[model samples]
Target: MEMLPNQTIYINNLNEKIKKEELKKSLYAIFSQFGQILDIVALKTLKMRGQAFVIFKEIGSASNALRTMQGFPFYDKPMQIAYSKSDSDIVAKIKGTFKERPKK
Candidate 1:
C-alpha cells in the first residue's frame, strides 16, 4: 500500500546486525521527541526486516517527525520510511475501542 499522511509512520533500513532491543530503545528516545507514542511495532523477528513502525499518538507528532527525520541515520544505517497506509490489529484496536464481537 502506498503510504499517505497518517498517524503511524513506518521506518526501515537500519543496520540489520543491531540487536532488536537496542534498535527499539533508540527509536524511543529519538522519535519520542515529536509525540507521545501509542505503541511501537517491533514485535516480530521474522517479520522484522530492518523495519519498525513509530506509532505516534497524534498527527502533530507524526507529521513533523517524518519530515524532519527524513533519511536520518539510526544504528549506523540511513533510515528511510513511509507513512502507514492500513494498520493491523494491534494498532487498529487502539482507536476502535473495540472488543471481539461474538458471532454464530
Candidate 2:
C-alpha cells in the first residue's frame, strides 16, 4: 500500500546500531534480498544515535519491502518501519501540539 500522502517510509537505527560502512552493507543486504533502492537518508541525534529513512522509487516495491522486512532481523536486531513525510517536521508538529498555550 502507498504510504500516507507526502509521507515516506522510515527505517530507523541502522546507523547507530551498526557502523556507517556496516550500515550500508546491511542496507545493501536488505535491498539485494528485496528490491531496488531509490533513496536513503541517515540522521544522527544529539545523543549520537543514528536514524535512517529510505524511499523506494516505486510504491509497489516499497510495499513489498515493508511487508517483507517488518519484524525481520537486521544486524541481529529486528527493524521497525513507519510511514511519515518528514521526521524533523513531524516531530516539531508533535511537540507543538503538546506545548502549552501562551497566557493572554
Candidate 3:
C-alpha cells in the first residue's frame, strides 16, 4: 500500500536472529531503494526477537519500502510494515504517572 504523507511506520515481526546493525542495514537497503531516508528513529523494545519501528521523513520512501518489501525476502525474513502513532501520544496516555513519588 502507498504510504500517506508524514506517516510513521512500525515494522514488526522481525527475525530474532538478526542483530541491530544487521536490521538497520536491512532497513537502510529497503528504504534507500525507494527514496532518501532523512533519519532512523531509535528502537524502543529490548527483545531479542525481531520487532522494530522507524519514522521516514518522507512518506514516498516508506510507501515504497512497504509496497516493495512488505512480503519480500530480506535477511532471511519477510518484512512487515504499518503506520505508527506518535510516541508522545503513547506516553501521554499514561497521564504523567511517572513523576517522583518521593520515596516514602
Choose the strongest candidate by TM-score: 1
Compose the digit string of candidate 1's lDDT tens values, residues 40-84: 766447456577787787776786777767778755777787777
> Across residues 1-104, which tens digit of lDDT does each residue of candidate 2 receive?
43443224666644365655565566666764676667766544423235566667576676667667766777566777666554554786777743546553
The residue-level lDDT of candidate 3 at 8 comes to 60
Superposed on all Cα atoms, model 3 deviates from the true structure by an RMSD in Å of: 4.7
Ranking by TM-score: 1, 2, 3
Q: lDDT per prediction?
A: 0.70, 0.60, 0.62
- Among these predicted structures, which one has the highest lDDT? 1
Alpha-carbon runs more than 4 Å astray in model 2: 1-7, 13-15, 43-50, 86-89, 94-104
Task: List candidate 3 segments past 4 Å from native.
Answer: 1-3, 42-49, 86-104
- Evaluate model 2: give its lDDT: 0.60
Worst 10 residues of 3 by lDDT: 40-49
TM-score of 1: 0.68
TM-score of each: 0.68, 0.65, 0.64
The better-scoring model by TM-score among 2 and 3 is 2
lDDT of 1 at 37: 70
